[PDB]
Each structure stands twice: as C-alpha cells, then as structure tokens.
Design a protein around this nucleic acid. Structure first.
Ligand SMILES: [Zn+2]
Ligand SMILES: [Zn+2]
Ligand SMILES: [Zn+2]
Ligand SMILES: [Zn+2]
Ligand SMILES: [Zn+2]
Ligand SMILES: [Zn+2]
Ligand SMILES: [Zn+2]
Ligand SMILES: [Zn+2]
Lengths: 131, 131
DNA sequence: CTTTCTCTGTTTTGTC
DNA sequence: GGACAAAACAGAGAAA
DNA sequence: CTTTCTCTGTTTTGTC
DNA sequence: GGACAAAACAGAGAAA
C-alpha cells in the first residue's frame, strides 16, 4: 500500500491528487492534496520550508524566496545590485546617496543611522526613545 | 492595555511570563508564554523562522541554524572549511578524496556521482533505478 | 566583541 | 470605524 | 540551461 | 515488533 504517490486510488471518496485554491482571490494551484491542504492553512508546502504565516495573502508574496529571479534593480549607474524585496532596495540606495534618515529623539543622544535595524538596536540597547 | 510585554499582570490566572519545557527530556527554556506555547507544538519561535517540524527532538537540533558557531571541521591539512551539520562534512571530504560512491544500477547507464543530490536528480529525471 | 549592510515576516501607514 | 496595498519596521544574520 | 557543491527537514539504517 | 541515535537521503539552492 505504501508508494510514491496518491494517483492510484484508495477505497475512500473521489480521488485524483488535487489542484486549485480559492481563499478569496488566490490564483495559484499546488500539485497535491497534501500540498494544497498545507497552503490552505497558511503553511508553505515547498520541501525544506514549512513556515507558518500570519496572512494568507503574504503566503503568495513569500513564494519569491523560492524563485531565483530578482526583478527590482538599483538605479545607480555602475551598480549591478538586484533585489527581490522593495525594502532592501530602499535602504541599499542610501549607500550611494549617503543619507542617514534615522535620528535618535532622546535629547542627550544625537546619533544618526543609515539603516533602520541599526536604529532599532540602538533604542533596544540604550532604552532611548522608548516607552 | 496594548504594551511591549506580558510582565504587568492582567485579570486572568497566575501570570509572570513563562520559562521551562519538559516533553520527555527537553532541557531548554523560552523567555515567554507565547514562545514556549509555540515550542511545545513543534514550531520554532525565533523571530523570522516559524517553521513547523515533524519531530520535537529535532526542534532542539534545528536551533543550530540560528547559532553562528560551526563545531564540525574538515580534517584535510590546508582546508579551513567548517560545518554545523554532519552530512555536509561527509560529502565535502569527497572533494579531497575524489570518491564517487553513487553508481546507477540501471544496466545501460553506468554513471557515477560524488554527491547524493546529483544522484537523486539523475534517477528522478531518467527514471533509472526507480520503481 | 565591532560596523556595515541585506533579508524577510509582521506591523504601520496611506489612500479610498 | 472599514477595506487594501505600499511602505516601513524589527529583528535576524551574513560579511569583513 | 549547465556542473559542482553545501544546507537542512525527514527518512532510513544500525545497535541495543 | 520496540526504542533511540547516527547516518543518509532528497530535495532546495547558492555559486560559477
Ligand atoms: Zn491560497
Ligand atoms: Zn516557503
Ligand atoms: Zn546600488
Ligand atoms: Zn540615542
Ligand atoms: Zn521541548
Ligand atoms: Zn528556527
Ligand atoms: Zn576540506
Ligand atoms: Zn542512470
């Protein structure tokens, strides 16, 4: 009874693998009943992933980590950098412009930061600009 | 009512965050009720991960991807390579030895392979040594 | 340990 | 209040 | 598209 | 048959 697939039928009810999803405008189809069952409950079925997600709409957006293509480009002349995610692009451009948009509001401290993660870390460590 | 933490008490029942796990010999403690609740049901609570797992015992072994340390070493003289996982080390050593342990059993084909993933792919594409 | 920078799951903001 | 999509955050974490 | 090689969640194997 | 840990697999996927 144990085999590679669920194409040969068991004594159950109307089987032939599975395909399409719905979930209010989900236009994507897994190639298995187990895969679409996971997709339906906000889990990435791709082998090796298996991540839970809060939003079903993001589960579709998540799939780009599994694709090898990088649509977003850096617009600076000699710069070949590419991205899958908009935020990476936004912060990367600062490397060219030199900008340091984040400014600690705590009055003693006057530190500026280029990237938000450095800014979040400064506040988490010092307690500046917090509460 | 919405805040950073669950240290200030609500009107519920015996609260003060959470800590230790059990699950038959799980000697690891999350620093939150939400984190340990996820751990208990085979989900990695670390932020950005959120992967489901089949075995609870592996959930502990999984945590090494989040640590930056690489205990396993390559024993060849000038080779600085290091690993977190035993299988990576085993297959990597073949680069030095030259070995090609995988041999297609299909009679016409006589192809050898160094790494198991190349061997699995050959069989999946050709249907050699399958069924 | 540091600094610099990218990745990505969730939260916040902006427009209707 | 509600969509819903765009942007931003807040970590994780790779590289030097 | 290719080849070469590493990562890691699950399965298989080996020892008791 | 059952532990349980060690090894191996089977993809994914990064690099050239
Ligand atoms: Zn869907
Ligand atoms: Zn995924
Ligand atoms: Zn650039
Ligand atoms: Zn400050
Ligand atoms: Zn546990
Ligand atoms: Zn994890
Ligand atoms: Zn080596
Ligand atoms: Zn073959």
């Amino acid at each position: 009874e144990k085999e590679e697939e669920e194409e040969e039928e068991e004594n159950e009810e109307e089987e032939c693998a599975a395909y399409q999803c719905n979930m209010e405008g989900c236009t994507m189809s897994f190639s298995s009943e187990k895969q679409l069952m996971l997709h339906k409950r906000n889990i990435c079925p791709i082998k090796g992933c298996g991540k839970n997600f809060f939003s079903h709409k993001y589960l579709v957006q998540h799939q780009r980590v599994h694709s090898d293509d990088r649509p977003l480009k850096c617009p600076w002349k000699g710069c070949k950098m590419t991205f899958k995610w908009a935020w990476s692009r936004t912060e990367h451009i600062r490397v060219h412009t030199g900008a340091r948009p984040y400014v600690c509001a705590e009055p003693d401290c006057g530190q500026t930061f280029r990237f938000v993660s450095d800014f979040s870390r400064h506040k988490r460590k010092t307690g500046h600009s917090v509460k």
